Design a protein around this ligand. Structure first.
Ligand SMILES: C[C@]12CCC(=O)C[C@@H]1CC[C@@H]1[C@@H]2CC[C@]2(C)[C@@H](O)CC[C@@H]12
Ligand SMILES: C[C@]12CCC(=O)C[C@@H]1CC[C@@H]1[C@@H]2CC[C@]2(C)[C@@H](O)CC[C@@H]12
Ligand SMILES: [Ca+2]
Ligand SMILES: [Ca+2]
Ligand SMILES: [Zn+2]
Ligand SMILES: [Zn+2]
Ligand SMILES: [Zn+2]
Ligand SMILES: [Zn+2]
Lengths: 172, 172
């Protein structure tokens, strides 16, 4: 299937930004396959507020890292196996009650409990980069992730209000 | 290549809406292939203003029809061969100086001269439907077009600010 490149050029901004109507979402999960040799970068960022309520999933030292900041919880966590072996890996990020679950190749590798109150009119999902400077993360990293993404599904497509790509979505 | 369906269900609204930054456009042309048995419908609508400055390309009696309303020109024109034979046809709509050109299967079939002043911050392109009730056209038609679209390219992708799909883009 058609794989896209997770970072154009110098990796300063996301390849794509989706905007979702929060009252319309009935699917609170995302899933995709990624392939990379890059140990560090952003895979995707999500927010309901860029100052207040945000999430990032990336790689640090080859392994998944989640940063989360909202009314309930503020955290920086690494978990799961290294993904930076150049092989395709399946990833799923799900909200299940008040938890956020991370699954890798079908196996749960992480569960952040007591982090989310009820699913802030709009949620944005940014692929390959953040919607704020990396310096404002809890723990900065260099956002550019040189890898591929394919078979991706972001929340509930029925609730997507719009999608923007700043430049050209490149092939992998 | 992947063809999409030009009308979901009862054909009241477009399948997809693209928004473009008018100062950024350097390509003032659009092109696509269509396949249909339906003699009447909208193929695409474009506006810089839904009251003031709009364009529609559709079929009426099987044949291309353009409606255009702007500061320079107000018109309803039919031209070209019937397209409602269920075969793939190549269509290109281009602005060339102050004209709007329509080409079918590589051949110019229509040139609307003296219709456009210089290429209103934003242009919208709506596929398969209008962004106003069909009753407000110069000459109403029933907008639903049961056909396929593939190999489509809309203006200058570098100038696209966002794209929205209200429901599910179906396969053809
Ligand atoms: C991980 C989730 C939920 C699961 C998913 O598909 C992606 C998405 C990313 C944005 C997160 C969201 C869970 C709830 C959060 C953390 C909000 O509190 C603010 C950002 C939201
Ligand atoms: C046909 C054009 C120009 C060529 C094209 O690719 C599609 C686009 C549709 C909107 C039209 C535009 C030409 C200029 C118009 C007619 C403006 O005056 C208002 C709507 C614009
Ligand atoms: Ca990197
Ligand atoms: Ca019809
Ligand atoms: Zn909040
Ligand atoms: Zn794996
Ligand atoms: Zn005007
Ligand atoms: Zn033909």
């Amino acid at each position: 299937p058609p794989a896209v490149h997770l970072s154009n050029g110098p990796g300063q901004e996301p390849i794509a930004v989706m905007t979702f109507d929060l009252t319309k979402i009935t699917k609170t999960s995302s899933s995709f396959e990624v392939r990379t040799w890059d140990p560090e970068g952003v895979i995707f960022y999500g927010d309901t507020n860029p100052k207040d309520d945000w999430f990032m999933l990336g790689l640090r030292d080859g392994r998944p890292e989640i940063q989360l900041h909202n009314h309930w919880a503020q955290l920086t966590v690494g978990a799961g196996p290294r993904l930076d072996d150049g092989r395709w890996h399946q990833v799923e990020v799900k909200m299940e009650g008040d938890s956020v679950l991370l699954e890798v190749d079908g196996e749960e590798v992480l569960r952040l409990r007591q982090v989310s109150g009820p699913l802030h009119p709009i949620m944005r999902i940014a692929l390959g980069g953040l919607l704020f400077p990396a310096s404002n993360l809890r723990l900065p990293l260099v956002p550019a992730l040189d890898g591929c993404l394919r078979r991706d599904s972001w929340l509930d497509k029925q609730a997507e209000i719009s999608a923007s790509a700043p430049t050209s979505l490149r092939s992998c």
